[PDB]
């Protein structure tokens, strides 16, 4: 509604798309990841609307146990339905985690990871 209102005035407007986060709550309510993924998958399919859902997020509590090879069982269909995946890693994790996140989750983008220089 805001985008259409701004566009009708012919004034400069800011197109905005939404990303559904998947909080890494770890032990608590393990079904939350599946619920969020399915919510995003079915929400991107509304179709009509200048604003839409274009991908999901993997931010949350980063840990060795919470690596990309821990939730990888649930992502077999996010790419199947045409979604996109970002990630948040490298702030405190291991370059192996970043490597698997790049190659297992097929993350098109990546968050932070300021220590890339140490891994040519």
Ligand X SMILES: Nc1ncnc2c1ncn2[C@@H]1O[C@H](COP(=O)(O)OP(=O)(O)OP(=O)(O)O)[C@@H](O)[C@H]1O
The residues carrying an active-site annotation are 91
Identify which of residues 11 and 46 has a Cβ nearer to its own copies in the complex.
46
Residues 1-20 that bind ligand X (CB under 6 A): 12-13, 15
Residues 32-51 that bind ligand X (CB under 6 A): none
Find which of ligand X, its own copies, none residue 61 binds, CB within 5 to 8 Å per kind.
none
Residues 6 or more apart whose Cβ sits within 8 Å of residue 85:
55, 56, 58, 75, 78, 79, 105, 106, 107, 108
Find which of its own copies, ligand X, none residue 80 binds, CB within 5 to 8 Å per kind.
its own copies
Distances (CA, A) of 80 to 2, 77, 99: 31, 5, 21
Q: Which of 87, 80, 89 is nearest to 108 (CA)?
A: 87
Using CB under 8 A, which of 2, 18, 25, 45 touches its own copies? 45
User: Is 23 marked as a binding-site residue?
Assistant: yes
Give residues in contact with ligand X (CB under 6 A): 12-13, 15
């Amino acid at each position: 509604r805001l985008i259409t209102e701004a566009k009708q005035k012919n004034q400069f407007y800011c197109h905005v798309n939404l990303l559904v986060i998947a909080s890494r709550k770890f032990s608590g309510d393990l079904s939350d990841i599946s619920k969020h993924l399915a919510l995003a998958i079915t929400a991107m399919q509304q179709g009509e609307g200048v604003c839409r859902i274009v991908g999901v997020d993997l931010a949350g509590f980063e840990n060795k146990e919470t690596r990309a090879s821990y939730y990888e069982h649930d992502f077999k269909a996010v790419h199947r339905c045409g979604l996109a995946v970002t990630a948040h890693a490298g702030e405190n994790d291991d370059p192996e985690g970043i490597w698997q996140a790049v190659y297992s989750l097929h993350a098109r983008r990546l968050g932070h990871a300021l220590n890339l220089l140490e891994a040519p």
